[PDB]
Design a protein around this ligand. Structure first.
Ligand code: MTE
Ligand code: MO
Ligand code: O
Length: 262
């Protein structure tokens, strides 16, 4: 349980996704393929102590411990929609601080062009990292990345809590990335490492299905997925079809960094 402010911009009147579901229906392959596997097995993960290490193309490499996650930077509550590529979405009241405040501390160098994220590796604690089938064929640890300007966008945040309290392990506690305008797979869980690199780093779902998932993965209703239309989505409310929005509804805040490019 923790304190936080509620900035005007991140507050709205969007129908929330019941906490039961936000923490009961998850994708966390390290704990199994089914939507219920994470909530049923994430209990085995030891999220305290913790070590989040910021390295690479940075002038001041730092390192945060479990307490730093909730105490080092001022926490905020942000109500973002969360759109998974599988075509189901939610509206979650996340709690965290913008990645740019952490990156600013580290002072990235003039050669930093990307941010590479990496999930913890603890095979005997995460069953999926032990069985090809339990784990889904992913090459562990789970890894992700963002262009520096994306990582620095005010909208992207290091999440440490949901629904007023610290994160249940199923949601990737103690630290998880959330990039609202992109498909869920970009929001890497239980981050133990953030490295600024010179080249575009590898992405776990891109590696596993190069033909289906890309690096940008910007939520877009006009571009389909090899196996399904992205035009409409299944909203997880209480107890549900609705149109998918351009940039998951953040087009005005984000169009700026993609305009005029590939
Ligand atoms: N390490 C790790 N992080 C991960 C995943 C995973 O399987 N392993 N899956 C995700 C996918 S595809 C989505 S859509 C979100 C799910 O967020 P949630 O469970 O918190 O709702 O976590 C992403 N982060
Ligand atoms: Mo996803
Ligand atoms: O996703």
């Amino acid at each position: 349980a923790l304190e936080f402010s509620k900035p005007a911009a991140w507050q709205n009147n969007l129908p929330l996704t019941p906490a039961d579901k936000v923490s009961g229906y998850n994708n966390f392959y390290e704990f199994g393929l089914d939507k219920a596997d994470p909530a049923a097995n994430a209990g085995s993960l030891k999220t305290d102590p913790w070590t989040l290490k910021i390295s690479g193309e940075v002038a001041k490499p730092l390192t945060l411990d479990h307490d730093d996650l909730t105490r080092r930077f001022p926490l905020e509550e942000r109500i973002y929609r969360m759109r998974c590529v599988e075509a189901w979405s939610m509206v979650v009241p996340w709690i965290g601080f913008p990645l740019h405040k952490l990156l600013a501390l580290a002072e990235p160098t003039s050669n930093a062009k990307y941010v590479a994220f990496e999930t913890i590796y603890a095979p005997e604690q995460m069953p999926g990292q032990q069985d090809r089938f339990i784990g889904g064929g992913l090459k562990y640890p789970y890894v992700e990345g963002l262009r520096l300007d994306e990582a620095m966008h005010p909208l992207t945040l290091m999440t440490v809590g949901v629904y007023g309290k610290a994160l249940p392990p199923q949601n990737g506690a103690p630290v998880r990335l959330i990039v609202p305008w992109k498909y869920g797979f970009k929001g890497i869980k239980s981050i133990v490492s953030i490295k600024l690199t010179r080249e575009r780093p590898p992405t776990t779902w891109n590696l596993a299905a190069p033909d289906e998932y890309g690096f940008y993965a910007n939520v877009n209703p006009y571009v389909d997925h090899p196996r399904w239309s992205q035009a409409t989505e299944r909203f997880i409310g209480s107890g549900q079809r609705q149109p998918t929005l351009l940039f998951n509804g953040y087009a005005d805040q984000v169009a700026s960094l993609y305009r005029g490019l590939d």
